[PDB]
Write a protein that binds this DNA or RNA. Structure first.
Ligand SMILES: [Mg+2]
Ligand SMILES: [Mg+2]
Ligand SMILES: [Mg+2]
Ligand SMILES: [Mg+2]
Ligand SMILES: [Mg+2]
Ligand SMILES: [Mg+2]
Ligand SMILES: [Mg+2]
Ligand SMILES: [Mg+2]
Ligand SMILES: [Mg+2]
Ligand SMILES: [Mg+2]
Ligand SMILES: [Mg+2]
Ligand SMILES: [Mg+2]
Ligand SMILES: [Mg+2]
Ligand SMILES: [Mg+2]
Ligand SMILES: [Mg+2]
Ligand SMILES: [Mg+2]
Ligand SMILES: [Mg+2]
Ligand SMILES: [Mg+2]
Ligand SMILES: [Mg+2]
Ligand SMILES: [Mg+2]
Ligand SMILES: [Mg+2]
Ligand SMILES: [Mg+2]
Ligand SMILES: [Mg+2]
Ligand SMILES: [Mg+2]
Ligand SMILES: [Mg+2]
Ligand SMILES: [Mg+2]
Length: 238
RNA sequence: GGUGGCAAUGGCUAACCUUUUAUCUGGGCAGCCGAAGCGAAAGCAACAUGUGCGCAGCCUUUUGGCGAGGCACGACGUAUACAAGUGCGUGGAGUCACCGGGGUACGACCCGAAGCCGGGUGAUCUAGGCGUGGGCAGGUUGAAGCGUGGCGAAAGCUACGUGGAGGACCGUAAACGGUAUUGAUCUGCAAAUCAUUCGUGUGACCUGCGUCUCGUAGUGAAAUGCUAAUCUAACCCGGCAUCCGCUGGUUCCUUCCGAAACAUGUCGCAGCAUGACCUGACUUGAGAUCGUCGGUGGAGUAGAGCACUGAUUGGCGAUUCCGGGGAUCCCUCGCUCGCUUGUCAAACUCCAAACCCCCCGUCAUCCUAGAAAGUCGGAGUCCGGACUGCUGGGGUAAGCUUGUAGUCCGUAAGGGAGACAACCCAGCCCGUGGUUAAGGUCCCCAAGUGUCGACUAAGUGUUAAUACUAAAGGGCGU
RNA sequence: UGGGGCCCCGAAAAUUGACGGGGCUCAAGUCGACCACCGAUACCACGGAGUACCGCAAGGUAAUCUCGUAGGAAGGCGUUGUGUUCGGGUCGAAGCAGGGCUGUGAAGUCCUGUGGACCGUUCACAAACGAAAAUCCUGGUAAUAGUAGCAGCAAAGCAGGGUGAGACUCCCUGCCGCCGAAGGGGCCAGGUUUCCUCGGCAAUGUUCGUCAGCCGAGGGUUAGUCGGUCCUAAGACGUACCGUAAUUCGAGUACGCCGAAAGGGAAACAGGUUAAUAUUCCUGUACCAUUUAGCGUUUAGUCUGACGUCUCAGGGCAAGCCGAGCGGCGUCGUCGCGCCGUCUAAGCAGCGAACCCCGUGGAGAGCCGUAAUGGCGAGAAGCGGGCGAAUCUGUAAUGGCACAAGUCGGCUUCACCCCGGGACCCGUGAAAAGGACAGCUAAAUGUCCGUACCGAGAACUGACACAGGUGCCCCUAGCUGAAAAGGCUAAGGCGUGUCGGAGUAAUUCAGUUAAGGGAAUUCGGCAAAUUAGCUCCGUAACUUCGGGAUAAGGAGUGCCUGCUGUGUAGACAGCAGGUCGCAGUGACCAGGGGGCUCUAACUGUCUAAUACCAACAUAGGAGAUUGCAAACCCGUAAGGGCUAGUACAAUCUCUGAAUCCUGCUCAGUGCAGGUACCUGAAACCCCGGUUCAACGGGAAGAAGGGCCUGUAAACAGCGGGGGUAGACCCUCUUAAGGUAGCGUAGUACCUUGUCGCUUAAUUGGCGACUUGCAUGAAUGGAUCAAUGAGAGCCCUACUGUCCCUAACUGGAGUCCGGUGAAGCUUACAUUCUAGUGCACAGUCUAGAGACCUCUAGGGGGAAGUGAAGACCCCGUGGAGCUUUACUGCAGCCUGUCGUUGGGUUGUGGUUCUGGAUGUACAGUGUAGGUAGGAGGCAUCGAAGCGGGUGCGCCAGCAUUCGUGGAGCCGUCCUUGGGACACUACCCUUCCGGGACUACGACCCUAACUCUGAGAAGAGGACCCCGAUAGGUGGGCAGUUUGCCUGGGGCGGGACGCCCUUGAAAAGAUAUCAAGGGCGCGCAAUGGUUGACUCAAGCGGGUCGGAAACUCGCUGAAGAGUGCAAGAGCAUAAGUCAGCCUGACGUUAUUCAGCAUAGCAGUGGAUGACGAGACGAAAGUCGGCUCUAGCGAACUUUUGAGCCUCCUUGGUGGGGGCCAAAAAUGACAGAAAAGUUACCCCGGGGAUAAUUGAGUCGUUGCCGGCAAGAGUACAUAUCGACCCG
């Protein structure tokens, strides 16, 4: 048995591949609201979240419990939020996507109703509402695809803050090193062709070349799906 | 196999009971072998002596007769399914022990690896992640930003001051590392240290304590590195007394006999099986041939020769061709056919030995104190080598390689060769006397400064064979 | 002139030397003869032992008996014990040491010395039964040897006086020394009594020892305030729930509980006391909690605990320094200086700098500030008040001091405390207990554990009193100086980094200096030297504009006298004059510099113990998957990682900064999509079969495959030649045929390629050309500033690297005292030369030398020692790794069955009605299936017609809605495809097809799934799950990968069969020996009878040409006989004709394969039984004249007939006997690919590199004959061919 790969080591969950959970501030989710309820609340502070490298907002609600929230751009300390079914459309509120007009930008969209939000969450991303049929609504995801969501889904209006995070090049191994200390990723990563034939399917030889084609089928067993997994095309555009 | 009990009306009991302490006495007929074989099976089912040769033994006129066991026939059972031939079987000897040998399975005469698998131990070292603390003498450069001021018509250009950035610079024997001396030491201070010279030294930094990740698994800025002096799969115990055709060892005396290093088969070539060769016992009972001479037969090697098959040298006469030279093919004329000259043959032979082989007769040797033949037990051996012949085959040759006949070393003393595995004499129980073999006789060294007739003038030579000893050519040297 | 004997020339090898040596000349040589003697265990004689065979024994015979390894056989000796017979011993058993006798021997017995209690023997039987060897095991003990070591990084001791049996080593004083930012002080972990006193010195201490961390006896650790205890971090553990065949096993969830002697934290200081304990005991002065009692009260929600890296201002203070007075000590040749001291805790009371808050204030064509950033009508400056620090002042103030002084000022201040500002982050830099806000007074309580000493060049760890490591973890005075560097000294600790004396060789470790030359040394400037601080001047090519840069290259520097400037000060900067030395950073410390190339962008990482690099990483570039109940992965499952995440994300790959760029190919392999068509398992369905099944076919058809399309920043590829100033038309184009670039390269074999610069001279360095064995574009191309313990070459300075060595210094060595090992060893040994020998001898053979012992010295030899070779081969030995090797297993994709329900309809029969619907040659009738080949119905209901009523031929049986008011049977059969009549329609059919079923699609919710505490929401009979069938599948596992071989490999097959030679005149006989062939063909190319003679020549005939057919002659074979070679054949074994199929079924021996002499199957020669062909008959025929053309067991199939399946009989289906076919060519018969330089083990000189030995083809050097050239002349000179 030539040694397992890095992906299977991540599978086991050894301490080298586990996220340092105790650093993260808090989990981000929408307020839990019963049927036919509408709770409000005004921002108390704007705070930095080390799990995403973007700001988050602290909001104190009328019942008493405060929650961190995914901060859309423009959110300022003092503004009140009106999450609920009867909310109007403004930058900051949380409203169903069924009664959001076409052309408006949204973020922190849910998959099924009352999930808290799963799509459109990294820095500066956003999605759009395209069409409103009776049973579904099509939103263009930041990847570039059309998704058909339930009309009774919740999403904050605006775009996620922190836009432009990747216009600043690293230009050092040290800065990227410092980012990786608060993530589960491993840094730095050895290249496969420089290993031994025990360690990887590509290792070995008197000179460093893959030897076999890099594209691998989708049916390859675990421990072999390394390279271009089931690629449809390769190369740049000529 | 040696020795015993019982014996076709066969031999022996097993577990167990009687045990009265393991003994022992008497029971125990279940069962096993023998008594009928043949055939896949269904099935079928034989001589309780018909003939001859004849050993031992007995009788006898010492020649013959009877003649158990032995051998050779004849007859019969069954299978081959049609027949005919043949196979196996048939005229009653087995069974149970004790003392031995051998085969097979088990640790299997004793020791000798790397490995494979099961369950457990380890992150005090080291590798990486996380928690919480500590550390980095002293200097250098001078980014952005800010103030004042010059050149300008706007845009703009520019000097000085302040400021203190950077995986920046220099540098401690603080700390971490480990270039070169290929220095010191190399049974050391040390199972990796020391001296000088060196690299980083505000960061992808060094580090204390705590905590987590581990064996087909972990960790790795990736060398197959590290995981407790162990890592191309750790360590402890168990399977395990693993296994090997491969290496080492295997303990007292004498006596009789005494090999093979070869053929065939083999995933066979460092192994094994069967045969040849050695040894022990038994059965049978009269011939055998290691040798000589004569004869009936087999030769196709040496030598020799051209009569066949292939080559081969000139002269002569013609092929009026099949042919090359320069319009009557003007005419030259090689290949070819005959007579004569000069050479050949391992796959040529009109011829043809000496050795050698089968058989008959004779002599000679062995033999009833057991020829030839047969049956059973135990093996070793299948790495060989050398000398004299075969102009042996191959090769330039070889103390080369591969054959063959004889004899040797292996396993062979003693005598002689300077020493000499296998060259000459000799095949050897112990002691004494005697004469010889090989070889020698100036001294070393036992016995000849021996005899007869010549040669050599070079210290040539003073060297049976021999893996140890020089050639062609020349000499008015003798 | 020829033929002979001996000798001479031809004739050269390496340590000195081989007739065996001395020597030998009418011989001590050679040739031909001869005589005498010596000389074995041979041969003769005598005596003796054993053996073989015979004999009843006595004994007899042996010229025809006496060697021996592997090995076979026979008889005996010994050790311990059992059964049995007979004994010995305190008047001395066993055992041990040495002797006498017996036996061929194993061995027995006796004697003497020792010893002090047990030991034998006859006949038999047993075994934990006999040792010289195993790099054997355990114990004891040699030589080496009184030897190495007791030096290298810290060279330390001397005098006087004691103690004591004994003094270099133990104690006191004086001098002389070592560390002094560690060798001093404080303490973690660790140790565990090492701590103190007394008494000892056998061992321990690298020597001695009266000493001791050693040995013996005794003694020593005191806490409300110092720690633990308490809180929580990473992260563990327990109980429950669930999983697992099961647990002591497994993730998650709930509830608990632990985890820091360096994180948070309620509270104590000074002095004294002991031999060893002290914020712990004692004196004094304090402080903090919990409970009880009394006297009152919340604000109860906030603050604090509570937080990163860098940088800076302000304040304070321990340490430090200076001046004056006072008290001691030192020096005193002269002077009057130098050092020590001049002290004082917590607690309590008081004060408060910055920031911040409040009341006034009214500032702009601008004012107020900071080291700096800055502030301002959203209210500056200024003026008031409030909250608010370290530290400071008083008291505590009487304790300690030689009760000796004990008084004052000043400067500075880190590395410590307080307070505030700024910058940076694709880094954001802990939590909880506790505390504050309502407490005051009084008494009582404050349990438990640790406390000695070390904390390291002697108390820990590495086996040690170990030059390593843990701990340099935290602290440290004066001068020089930037400094905690280096040097010199305090306090403190030591003369123990535990051997001394003596002073004299070589050699050795580490240093100092060196004339003249200056890399000439060497693979290579390795090693060593040069330079070196600070100030000023000056500074190149190139460049990513940041740099290069301390570039390069120059000048100054001491001491004394007097000053100036900045500053609150500490201090810093500058000047003028004088002056000394060879030298002024005077010692310590402290860069040599420059130029041209290759390579990697840079800082970083790496084989702990031979590799610090060009390798790895990196920022930058590109590609791929995935919309989250996702992609990727772990688990048997329960459940999880990524993930407190969401496409500016995670995961998976290639390339490797910047700059200029990145061409052509989709044939191969891989990947993705399409699946028109072909192939494609099981279940269900249909047919046949089976009294039921097994079983055989058909239909249908999932995934996958074929086929098609796309894809190269997917793995990869980018070719020949010959025409043409090496072009370009053609090619060879099995997809295309190298674009920019670079080019003798880190790639170029030829090769030291050609030319230029660099040297007197260059297999070099650089530049240019370049036909590139075998360059080339993210298998990245080219170039590149800065960086480099990277790799080459050149210049300058410098030097003992060198010419060529010399003197000196310290440590060893040499000599003396003490202590005190280890490793090679069969034995002997004073050697040298040659030979011989397993061909590399101190021991053998022949010579030559050598009196013995000891010391020093370097290493010639002992194929010196260390070690079961790492190189090569072998083993039906291993391991890891790779793949389109052989066989499998996980993972994934898909069909079917279960979980699994209710409807919408399209499917098909299943199943059910209205008519026998049934009807062509029609019909009066509709074949009321078929059919008793026909006899009952009918105004008591039967007809012709309608759109037409079952239906069909708009006919007509039924009586239906009628319509006329007869269709009757048919023996008028519409004389029939079927000819027809009611109680029969049992059945072409009709087919609401309702009905259970299986398919394709759609809908619903109640199962089920996800989310939520739950209401509920979202999906939904799908998915997950259990089982089964097919695919893909080096992800993983178990194995195989042969042998021969002038080593293995490569080549080949001498790996099965047949012929000739080798092969030596019977038979046998090897090599990778020579010549070769076969793995077939034929219904005639076979059998038999009959008739004939073939090849080649000569003579004749018409173009029938020297190429045809025919006639005559010669013709033993010169032809033919299927195929190699050899053999055979003439009234034939050849050619042709006639008739035929013996190219037959069954069966026994013998021969060779495989001499002699075992071994399949299988073939070839004789026969036997049964049938034939040809021929008058004899006879011939078991294929093709003879010798090649082929394969076991097991398994399947086929042929004839039988035997058989478990209590009996039958059916279907199996099993068996005999023969034929299907193949194992590695051919006496495995289902079978590579690599290892990361390798491991067991053996081999049974087998290779090269040291040796043998040979000499080749190589080096000569000779013989002389052909010829040399103007004539072979030989002044050169020398052919051939020969040695
Ligand atoms: Mg692999
Ligand atoms: Mg028959
Ligand atoms: Mg400046
Ligand atoms: Mg440095
Ligand atoms: Mg074991
Ligand atoms: Mg001859
Ligand atoms: Mg053998
Ligand atoms: Mg001989
Ligand atoms: Mg012999
Ligand atoms: Mg001899
Ligand atoms: Mg023997
Ligand atoms: Mg012994
Ligand atoms: Mg000092
Ligand atoms: Mg001592
Ligand atoms: Mg605790
Ligand atoms: Mg000394
Ligand atoms: Mg680098
Ligand atoms: Mg790389
Ligand atoms: Mg390309
Ligand atoms: Mg050079
Ligand atoms: Mg073998
Ligand atoms: Mg494998
Ligand atoms: Mg196995
Ligand atoms: Mg071989
Ligand atoms: Mg490697
Ligand atoms: Mg080995």
């Amino acid at each position: 048995m030539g040694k397992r790969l890095i992906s299977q080591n991540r599978g086991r969950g050894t301490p080298t591949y586990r996220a340092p959970s105790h650093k993260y501030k808090a989990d981000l989710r929408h307020p839990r609201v019963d049927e036919n309820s509408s709770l409000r609340g005004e921002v108390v502070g704007i705070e930095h979240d080390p799990a995403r490298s973007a700001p988050i907002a602290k909001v104190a609600f009328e019942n008493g419990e405060e929650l961190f929230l995914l901060a859309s751009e423009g959110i300022a300390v003092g503004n009140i939020i009106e999450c609920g079914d009867d909310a109007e459309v403004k930058p900051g509120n949380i409203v169903p996507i069924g009664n959001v007009p076409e052309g408006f930008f949204i973020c922190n969209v849910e998959s099924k109703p009352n999930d808290g939000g799963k799509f459109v969450r990294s820095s500066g991303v956003y999605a759009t509402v395209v069409t409103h049929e009776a049973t579904r609504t099509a939103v263009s995801m930041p990847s570039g695809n059309i998704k058909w969501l339930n009309p009774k889904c919740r999403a904050v209006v605006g775009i996620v803050a922190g836009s432009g995070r990747v216009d600043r090049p690293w230009l050092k191994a040290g800065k990227k090193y410092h980012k990786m200390k608060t993530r589960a990723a491993k840094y730095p990563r050895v290249s496969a062709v420089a290993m031994n034939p025990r360690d990887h399917p590509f290792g070995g030889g008197a000179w460093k070349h893959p030897g076999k084609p890099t594209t691998v089928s989708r049916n390859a067993p675990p421990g072999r799906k390394v390279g271009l997994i089931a690629a449809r095309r390769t190369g740049m555009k000529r």
